[PDB]
Design a protein around this nucleic acid. Structure first.
Ligand code: MG
Lengths: 49, 1342, 586
DNA sequence: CCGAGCAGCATACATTACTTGTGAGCGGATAAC
DNA sequence: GTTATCCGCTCACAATGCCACACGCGCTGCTCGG
């Protein structure tokens, strides 16, 4: 009833709460419109760093 | 004289003056009819299976020139019988086969085929038939599919009354809904811009779709406006004028014409001058060129040689551009007619906002809108738009819907295509634009003219077509990839999806549900019940306070008084008594045709709108026996309202008073004396009634009881009249007369009266035979009363002697105090039957066996069972005992084959025992009455199974043997008649038995041929009956379908003679519910001066608040009925002569003022009068129609017939003291029901026990032995008081903190009420759930 | 953790897969496949799409809401994500944390049981024997009647003749909690002392059942047993019925004798002008009681009775002033219940319902609390007693119709007829015509109502030693009304007199009203319109219940913090309370 | 050669579906310097 | 033109409590199996 498990994700992944909970935490934290953030999370864009 | 043999037993005295003209129709007429239009081979292709078939067929390949089609279909008779299907636990399915012809157009060649393959009768699943009572015997249970009331497909125009934009600019939207497709609609933006929308997509300025249909700006502007011409004459541009145009609004200058001046240079031309202009017939008006400012031109004008366009189509106009263009022509300047009130400029604004310009741009715009992000080609968008509509398959208007549409636009041709059309779209647009202007009018949705019912057949064929289109796709792709000519049309299609769809519908539907089968009335009202929920229908969440309210057109088409109280009022509705679905699907009600002045007895059925046309009279309009209203300003209803009208103004009378209410409310005597708010709960309580031991007629009925009993199923009604040959307590055997019989089938027919059998509400059903032995019966007469039925009359409760007076508060608020005499006579003791099923799996660890021995329990727990391991039929078990009888393979993973060899022969069945045996649940006692055993074929048998199968075999064999006996009797009569008419055989065929008959001999020549005939047909018949006995025996002892790893389902039944007790819930028939409070001793109830006590004593303070005086009136009439009965009892105690008793009864039957029935009491046999009187010993049953009830004066006269006081009030006496109550109290005989809210289903408590495993809390539910739930509001209350410690202990140590609660237990058994609380494991579960998310939540250190 | 998402089994091996395991399997499967792809040279677009799919699956697991759905196989419904196990009416908060199911309780259906005292409450033997089981085990261990716990379980299983004595002992003062299903306000849960009864019903005092807003239509009630000592004493001190006698909302008394006793007392306090026994002198109330029970004097006849009404001249004293007041036998009998406090003027009146509330209020004001609860219980007892002894009974011939109703209705009919003719004669606009029609109809309705009232309330014209005298009616109806026992005159006139106008579904008012009444017949149209109104009302109730529930739930979760901590904030700013004046009266 | 487990599948599609009432972030039109 | 301003567009997010009862709860063609 107590012990928890963990999954070593084979690649990083977003946390659906902080992405789609108005106002999106990531959006305000990055000064980036949420639409572009969604378009780059789901692999249909690019972002220069 | 018109009364059947059933009626002549107890003919109910009938009040009511209105002469009924139309007998109440077959109550279930909806359901069967529905399934009829679903199951018969309709050659018109309009509806039924044919409809779905011809909609999906003919399929083809990927245009691969290989087609499938159906020739016709058929339905083999079901393999089982409705009783056998219901008891064995299998649907009452019917195989469905169809003639599939497959053509293969070889390539390359034109239309033609050398490769044809004709595979008939392919087995595409089985469909559940509808029994002759409208139900659907699905596996085990008996479902009923309610009809669903919903928006009719078509078009309608809603106002959207200002709820948006807070502007009072009400924006009339208009929508078109198909039957199978994507609906469409238009809206007026608050900027007066039309906006087209597909079902729910991004809004689009409507005019775009116009270009989507080969329509340029020119045609679009032409089809929406009036061309005001401007002819450039020698000067002044004399445009053509119609007076109402300039009538309009403010004028600007003088409008002189033909020399004279007709309107000065003023403003807002007065109607007088406009009429004067109409007189003068002006065809042209000299106007200044400056006036044309807005005036956007329609025709697209170009220059004569420069190629370019000097005047586009619907761009604008302006003086500069006008002088710029008129240097080429002109002679015909066609502009649009604009006006802010009529012919409003609502299309020009749209074409302004319209971004596109060309048809292909329209296609690409609609294509992007439908599904964004796709490469728009010509073919892609074009095919998408030609599939959105204009496609027989992807869309259909449901010719009923085509009628609704085609009529809502005032067109004439009712018939029409089932597909949209450009003219239809532009007509809808024109209608909507008119709605934005003055003319035209919006139409509400709750009006029955727009809400159609959808029966079982229609929804069934809908689901069938849905399940069919997917197998169509599958067979198309398989025909594509698969070979052209090698196959046989029996495997490219699979019955799996068809069966899956139809079975998931009939079994697990939002609409279908197990029948409310605890009462005949409940059964009926649940069959003819109209719902508004379900697929394609609204839900109770988004219902809205508007829909539930009754619309003035509900009168006669749907009952307004019967509807479930609570979260769904008005959604669920009971269909009216005389109501009847239309050909298209609307609710048409009968009406009496009124000629000029006379009221005919002819009837017409009318829908909502047809009735709205005429003016309808009323049934309470007292006639004059010749079609004439004795009044003049008769009340009437013309257009959804009530008003007075003269005698020569009506056009249709109501058929009968009862047509306003449902069959449910129809059973409420003196209904019109009750508040609707009470009659609702009255009907609803009447539905939930419960059958008793000795059902008995209700003294005050409404005549509808005979019809509702005989039209339901619970009664075993005779098929063909004749003589009752043999009656028993379980079987009936009738010998039909010589007229209604066939060549074979000597005439006997058998009715197996279903004895005590479970129901979907765990209450008993039973058909005791009502007819005696040898009494002749006619066609369609009740031969066995069902549950809560008496002599073919619906009889739910009992006629209890009640009195209205407070009794020491034992009936304080609404309670009820009864007499122990009611308990002693078992007037209310019901029977409760419940089943318990034990399954025998086949675990991969090992199979399941039902052996008698149990490894652990003592002798007691194995005493009830038999040698096989099942209880005997009769052991009065109690909660905890063992019904079966089952052991399981417990252990696993030893893997010592040196011991496996031991326990494979020496311990073959003593290795891994475990007593997972079916015990009766804790609390439920009773008697075991029946045991069914379903054994999976292959699994060998059990002794009890063999015994029950042999018993069933014997029962079946008895019928065939009795039929064989009657056939042999006829055949030996034939032989003896042949072997006596010559020979001669005189003292042989009487003394000599059947031993040597089939081998004797008369003279050979022809009589030996007679012997050949009548002695070879003998053994031919014998062989035939042997064949059919073998067939029945096969059906009895064949396999049983138990799919997912199960071997033997053993079902055991338990019966309880559930008595009455303080705590049950009883009610009359007027919503006067109440909890029974005390079984007061008989010597304490109030009692009349004649020593008779009173059974029930109600509370009078319940009448004046809940204003339903009807019951009291009923009660009065009750004491009338019993009165007569009492008097008759006198005539029956002393053996009074039959003539005198007949005379008295005859005086009784004709007491009303002017009653509809006139029985004579003559032409009744001097002994049939005696049987009738004996049936009337317990009181004269009285029929009072719903809205033709007996007035109080008739009740006074009836009481005067007896020796009872007219006031209906008698000086009582307190059984305790012995002194009389002053103020003589009311006492009568009221009918009283009993509801299955009985106390033994609610009272239970929980000290300790099991707990939920995910959250360590006690379970919820009486069955799970769980405890009550302390809810939010309970906690808020508990903490409202300063009950800190109470709330704390109720939170932690009562329900959670497993260590804390075990400590509390161990500490409270030790006489110390101190708690050691902690952290409720529910909270730790919450911690672990949040922590399972990315969130980190901790308990702070300090 | 695994246990919190348990794979619950079935009778065979058909383990019901909790959707959490399904989501986790989906995600871990994406992860394993993606790792395997990462190892095999990673075709770039392939691994791209695979990471996208894994992101989608993880999003669905954390919340199935956004990004479409993740529907289970062949069961067209979304899967409970983690958030779905926290939010909503089934989330852990509103489902298990805030309100958790209790293992130590029970429920049943409530009868009346009008004999028990105000703090007592009925309890079925079965329910008590099931609830107090641990206490019974403890008591048995004490008396040594069963040394082992399993022996005591067996003894309770057999219900030996000693276990009932034990149970009766163990609850002699042990309180208990009774609760109604919708617990709207604080009184929805009260504390009583149980009394063992038979059957399975739960008796409860009628007054508190008027407080629970509990009828006897079969409404069920839940029981609870406070087991720790703190909780027992807390229920005894705080939520015992003899503590809650004023609503926390208004300082009005919640213990109001509702019906069936106000009728009783009202009948006991009236005055027939010529009743058997009128004109005597009684040496006291007990004398009148004996004179009545012996069947010599009517329950209500004017007499001269000596009465000793006590008083409190100085604070604490109780003087007695033995007066000789003109009264009736009934009032004198009732005087044997007032507890040495209130003056005689509290009884001498007709003593309807508002009068009973006033009497109880002034008794709580003068004498304190304990004599007031005893006095209220005595009132309830005597009210039921003499109500039964009265035999109040409504018959069909009780409700009368005034002999002008037919005439008034015919006259108003002539009026509306000539008005409508005037309209069709072009003398008044249709709207003002409608207005005139509804106006004359309402006027005729008021006429009929007043006529019915003036004929019913005083039809009793009796004579004493001579000619004739009028008096307030003795009709059963209007005795259930004038006393305020049940129903108002508005419902009476809607029963005997004309039913009046009725309302369209939209809210407008039909021209032609329901000229008929309940005692007479109702035509089909009239019943139809009444049904319009009734269904409007019922739908309104069925929606307002849920809406008000949501409202109060929002309320209690914005003020749930307020607790009075400080004893004196020490400020000077308040509001200027002034009597409200809407323009008319105050 | 079909019976008994499995792995990732909106069944592939056009599924689909009127108003629910309210707040709140957001993108195209808008006034001003 | 731009910079800040505002207004309609679309999406998230709530829907009384209990009680009881009922019903159901993947599959399926690929995969492991003889
Ligand atoms: Mg209630």
């Amino acid at each position: 009833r107590e012990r928890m498990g963990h999954i070593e994700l084979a690649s990083p992944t977003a946390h659906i709460w902080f992405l789609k909970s108005l106002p999106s935490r990531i959006g305000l934290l990055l000064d980036m419109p949420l639409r572009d953030i969604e378009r780059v999370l789901y692999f249909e864009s690019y972002v220069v760093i | 004289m018109v009364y059947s043999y059933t009626e002549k037993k107890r003919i109910r005295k009938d009040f009511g003056k209105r002469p009924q003209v139309l007998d109440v129709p077959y109550l279930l007429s909806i359901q069967l009819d529905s399934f009829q239009k679903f199951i018969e081979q309709d050659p018109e292709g309009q509806y039924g299976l044919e409809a779905a078939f011809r909609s999906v067929f003919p399929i083809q390949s990927y245009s691969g020139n290989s087609e499938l089609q159906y020739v016709s279909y058929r339905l083999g008779e079901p393999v089982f019988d409705v009783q056998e299907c219901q008891i064995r636990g299998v649907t009452y399915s019917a195989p469905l086969r169809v003639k599939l012809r497959l053509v293969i157009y070889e390539r390359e060649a034109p239309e033609g085929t050398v490769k044809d393959i004709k595979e008939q009768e392919v087995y595409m699943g089985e469909i559940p038939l509808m029994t002759d009572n409208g139900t659907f015997v699905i596996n085990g249970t008996e479902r009923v599919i309610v009809s669903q009331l919903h928006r009719s497909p078509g078009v309608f125009f809603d106002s959207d009354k200002g709820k948006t934009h807070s502007s009072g600019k009400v924006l009339y939207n208009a929508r078109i809904i198909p039957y199978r497709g994507s609906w469409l609609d238009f809206e007026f933006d608050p900027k007066d811009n039309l906006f087209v929308r597909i079902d729910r997509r991004r809004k689009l300025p409507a005019t775009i779709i116009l270009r989507a249909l080969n329509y340029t700006t020119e045609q679009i502007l032409d089809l929406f406006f009036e061309k005001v011409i401007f002819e450039i004459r020698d000067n002044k541009l004399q445009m053509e004028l119609v007076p109402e145009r300039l009538r309009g609004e403010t004028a600007s200058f003088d409008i002189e014409a033909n020399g004279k001046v007709y309107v000065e240079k003023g403003r807002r031309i007065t109607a007088r001058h406009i009429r004067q202009l109409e007189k003068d017939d002006v065809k042209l008006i000299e106007v200044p060129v400056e006036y044309i400012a807005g005036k956007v031109v329609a025709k697209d004008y170009i220059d004569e040689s420069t190629g370019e366009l000097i005047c586009a189509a619907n761009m604008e106009l302006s003086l500069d551009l006008l002088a710029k263009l008129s240097q080429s022509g002109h002679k015909r300047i066609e502009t649009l007619f604009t006006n802010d009130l009529d012919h409003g400029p609502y299309i020009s604004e749209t074409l302004r906002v319209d971004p596109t310009n060309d048809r292909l741009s329209a296609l690409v715009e609609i294509y992007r809108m439908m599904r964004p992000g796709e490469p728009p080609t010509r073919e892609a968008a074009e095919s998408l738009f030609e599939n959105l509509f204009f496609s027989e398959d992807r869309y259909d208007l449901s010719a009923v819907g085509r009628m609704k549409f085609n009529r809502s636009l005032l067109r004439e041709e009712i018939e029409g295509s089932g597909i949209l059309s450009k003219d239809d779209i532009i007509d809808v647009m024109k209608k909507l634009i008119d709605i934005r202007n003055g003319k035209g009018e919006v139409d509400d949705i709750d009006h029955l003219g727009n809400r159609r019912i959808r029966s079982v057949g229609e929804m069934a064929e809908n689901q069938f077509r849905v399940g069919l289109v997917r197998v169509e796709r599958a067979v198309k792709e398989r025909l594509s990839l698969g070979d052209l000519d090698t196959l046989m049309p029996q495997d490219m299609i699979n019955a799996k999806p068809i069966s899956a769809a139809v079975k998931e519908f009939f079994g697990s539907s939002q609409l279908s549900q197990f029948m409310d089968q605890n009462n005949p009335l409940s059964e009926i009202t649940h069959k003819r019940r109209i719902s508004a929920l379900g697929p394609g229908g609204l839900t109770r969440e988004r219902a809205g306070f508007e829909v539930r309210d009754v619309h003035p057109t509900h009168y006669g088409r749907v009952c307004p008084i019967e509807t479930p109280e609570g979260p769904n009022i008005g959604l669920i509705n009971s269909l009216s008594v005389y109501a009847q679905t239309n050909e298209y699907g609307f609710l048409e009600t009968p009406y009496r045709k009124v000629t000029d002045g006379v009221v005919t007895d002819e009837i017409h059925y009318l829908s909502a709108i047809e009735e709205g046309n005429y003016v309808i009279a009323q049934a309470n309009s007292n006639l004059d026996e010749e079609g004439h209203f004795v009044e003049d300003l008769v009340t009437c209803r013309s257009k959804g309202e009530s008003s007075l009208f003269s005698r020569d103004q009506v056009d249709y009378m109501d058929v009968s008073t009862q047509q306003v209410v449902s069959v449910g409310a129809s059973l409420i005597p003196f209904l019109e004396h009750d508040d609707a708010n009470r009659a609702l709960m009255g009907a609803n309580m009447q539905r939930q009634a419960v059958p008793t031991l000795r059902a008995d007629k209700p003294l005050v009925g409404t005549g509808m009881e005979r019809a509702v009993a005989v039209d339901s199923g619970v009664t075993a009604v005779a098929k063909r009249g004749g003589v009752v040959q043999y009656v028993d307590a379980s079987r009936i055997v009738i010998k039909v007369n010589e007229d209604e019989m066939y060549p074979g089938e000597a005439g006997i027919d058998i009715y197996n009266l279903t004895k005590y059998t479970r129901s979907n509400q765990n209450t008993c059903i039973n058909q005791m035979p009502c007819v005696s032995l040898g009494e002749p019966v006619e066609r369609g007469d009740v031969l066995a009363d069902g549950p809560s039925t008496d002599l073919g009359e619906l009889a739910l409760g009992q006629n209890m002697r009640v009195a209205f007076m407070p009794w020491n508060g034992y009936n304080f608020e609404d309670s009820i105090l009864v007499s122990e005499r009611v308990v002693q006579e078992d007037r209310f003791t019901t029977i409760h039957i419940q089943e318990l099923a034990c399954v025998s799996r086949d675990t991969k660890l090992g199979p399941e066996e039902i052996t008698a021995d149990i490894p652990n329990v003592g002798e007691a727990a194995l005493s009830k069972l038999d040698e096989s391991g099942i209880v005997y039929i009769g052991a009065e078990v109690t909660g905890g005992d063992i019904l079966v009888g089952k052991v399981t393979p417990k252990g696993e993973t030893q893997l010592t084959p040196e011991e496996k060899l031991l326990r494979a022969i020496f311990g073959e069945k003593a290795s891994d025992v475990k007593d997972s045996s079916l015990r009766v649940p804790n609390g439920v006692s009773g008697t075991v009455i029946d045991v069914q055993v379903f054994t999976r074929d292959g699994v060998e048998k059990d002794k009890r199974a063999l015994e029950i199968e042999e018993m069933q075999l014997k029962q079946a064999k008895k019928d065939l043997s009795e039929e064989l006996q009657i056939l042999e009797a006829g055949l030996f009569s034939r032989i003896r008649a042949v072997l006596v008419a010559g020979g001669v055989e005189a003292e042989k065929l009487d003394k000599l038995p059947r031993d040597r008959w089939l081998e004797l001999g008369l003279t050979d020549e022809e009589k030996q041929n007679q012997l050949e005939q009548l002695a070879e047909q003998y053994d031919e018949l014998k062989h035939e009956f042997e064949k059919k006995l073998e067939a029945k025996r096969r059906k009895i002892t064949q396999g049983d379908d138990l799919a997912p790893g199960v071997l033997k389902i053993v079902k055991v039944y338990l019966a309880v003679k559930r008595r009455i007790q303080p705590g049950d819930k009883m009610a009359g028939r007027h919503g006067n519910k109440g909890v029974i409070s005390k079984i007061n001793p008989i010597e304490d109830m109030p009692y009349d001066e004649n020593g008779t006590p009173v059974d029930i004593v109600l509370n009078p303070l319940g009448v004046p608040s809940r204003m339903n005086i009807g019951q009291i009136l009923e009660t009065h009439l009750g004491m009338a009925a019993k009165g007569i009965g009492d008097k008759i009892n006198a005539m029956l105690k002393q053996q009074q002569e039959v003539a005198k008793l007949r005379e008295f009864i005859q005086r009784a039957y004709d007491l009303g003022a002017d009653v509809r029935q006139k029985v004579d009491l003559s032409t009744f046999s001097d002994e049939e009068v005696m049987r009738l009187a004996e049936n009337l010993r317990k009181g004269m049953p009285i029929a009072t129609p719903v809205f033709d009830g007996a007035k109080e004066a008739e009740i006074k006269e009836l009481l005067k017939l007896g020796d009872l006081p007219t006031s209906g009030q008698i000086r009582l006496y307190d059984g305790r003291t012995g002194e009389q109550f002053e103020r003589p109290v009311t006492v009568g005989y009221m009918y009283m029901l009993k509801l299955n809210h009985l106390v033994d289903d609610k009272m239970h408590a929980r000290s300790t026990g099991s707990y939920s495993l995910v959250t360590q809390q006690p379970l919820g539910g009486k069955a799970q032995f769980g405890g009550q739930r302390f809810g939010e509001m309970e906690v808020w209350a508990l903490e409202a008081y300063g009950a800190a410690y109470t709330l704390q202990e109720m939170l932690t140590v009562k329900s959670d903190d497993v260590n804390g609660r075990t400590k509390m237990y161990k500490n409270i058994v030790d006489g110390n009420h101190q708690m050691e609380p902690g952290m409720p494991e529910s909270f730790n579960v919450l911690l672990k759930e949040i922590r399972s998310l990315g969130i980190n939540i901790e308990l702070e250190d300090e | 953790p695994p246990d919190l998402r348990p794979l619950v089994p079935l009778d065979g091996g058909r383990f019901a897969t909790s959707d959490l395991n399904d989501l986790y399997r989906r995600v871990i499967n994406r992860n394993n496949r993606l790792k395997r792809l990462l190892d095999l040279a990673a075709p770039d677009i392939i691994v791209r799409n695979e990471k996208r799919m894994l992101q989608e699956a993880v999003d669905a697991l954390l919340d199935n809401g956004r990004r479409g759905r993740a529907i289970t196989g062949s069961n067209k419904r979304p899967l409970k994500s983690l958030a779905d196990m926290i939010k909503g009416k089934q989330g852990r908060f509103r489902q298990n944390l805030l309100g958790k199911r209790v293992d130590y309780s029970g429920r049943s259906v409530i009868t009346v049981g009008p004999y028990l005292r105000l703090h007592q409450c009925g309890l079925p033997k079965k329910m008590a024997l099931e609830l107090f089981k641990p206490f019974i085990y403890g008591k048995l261990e004490l008396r040594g009647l069963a040394t082992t716990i399993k022996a005591a379980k067996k003894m309770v299983e057999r219900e030996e003749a000693v276990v009932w004595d034990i149970l009766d002992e163990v609850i002699r003062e042990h309180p208990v909690l009774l609760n109604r299903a919708p617990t709207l306000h604080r009184l929805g849960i009260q504390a009583f002392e149980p009394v063992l009864i038979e059957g399975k019903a739960i008796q409860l005092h009628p007054l508190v059942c008027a407080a629970y807003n509990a009828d006897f239509d079969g409404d069920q009630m839940a029981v609870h047993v406070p087991l720790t000592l703190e909780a027992q004493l807390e229920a005894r001190a705080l939520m015992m019925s003899t503590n809650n006698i004023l609503s926390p909302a208004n300082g009005e008394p919640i213990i109001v004798p509702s019906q069936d006793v106000v009728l009783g007392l009202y009948y006991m306090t009236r005055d027939c002008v010529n009743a058997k026994g009128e004109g005597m002198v009684l040496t006291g109330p007990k004398e009148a009681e004996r004179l009545y029970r012996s069947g010599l004097a009517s329950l209500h006849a004017r007499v001269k009775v000596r009465i000793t009404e006590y008083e409190k001249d100085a604070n604490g004293e109780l003087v007695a002033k033995t007066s000789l007041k003109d009264t009736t036998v009934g009032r004198a009998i009732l005087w044997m219940i007032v507890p040495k406090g209130l003056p005689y003027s509290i009884v001498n009146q007709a003593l309807g319902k508002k009068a009973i509330s006033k009497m109880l209020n002034t008794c709580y004001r003068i004498l304190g609390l304990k004599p007031t609860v005893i006095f209220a219980d005595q009132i309830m007892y005597t009210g039921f007693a003499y109500a039964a002894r009265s035999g109040a009974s409504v018959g069909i011939d009780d409700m009368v119709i005034p002999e002008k109703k037919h005439e008034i209705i015919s006259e108003a009919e002539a009026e509306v007829a000539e008005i409508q003719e005037q309209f069709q004669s072009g003398l008044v606009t249709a709207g003002e015509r409608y207005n005139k029609v509804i106006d004359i109809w309402a006027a005729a309705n008021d006429r009929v109502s007043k006529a019915m009232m003036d004929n019913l309330q005083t039809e009793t014209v009796i004579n004493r030693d001579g000619q004739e005298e009028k008096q307030v009616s003795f009709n059963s109806i209007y005795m259930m009304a004038d006393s305020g026992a049940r129903g108002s005159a508005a419902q009476i006139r809607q029963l005997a007199g004309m039913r009046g106008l009725m309302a369209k579904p939209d809210g407008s008012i039909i021209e032609t009203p329901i000229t008929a009444n309940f005692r007479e017949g109702l035509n089909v149209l009239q019943y139809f319109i009444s049904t319009h109104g009734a269904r409007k009302g019922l739908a309104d109730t069925a929606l307002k219940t849920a809406n008000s529930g949501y409202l109060t739930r929002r309320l209690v979760d914005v003020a749930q913090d307020l607790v009075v901590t400080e004893d004196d904030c020490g400020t000077h700013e308040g509001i200027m309370m002034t009597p409200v004046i809407e323009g008319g009266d105050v």
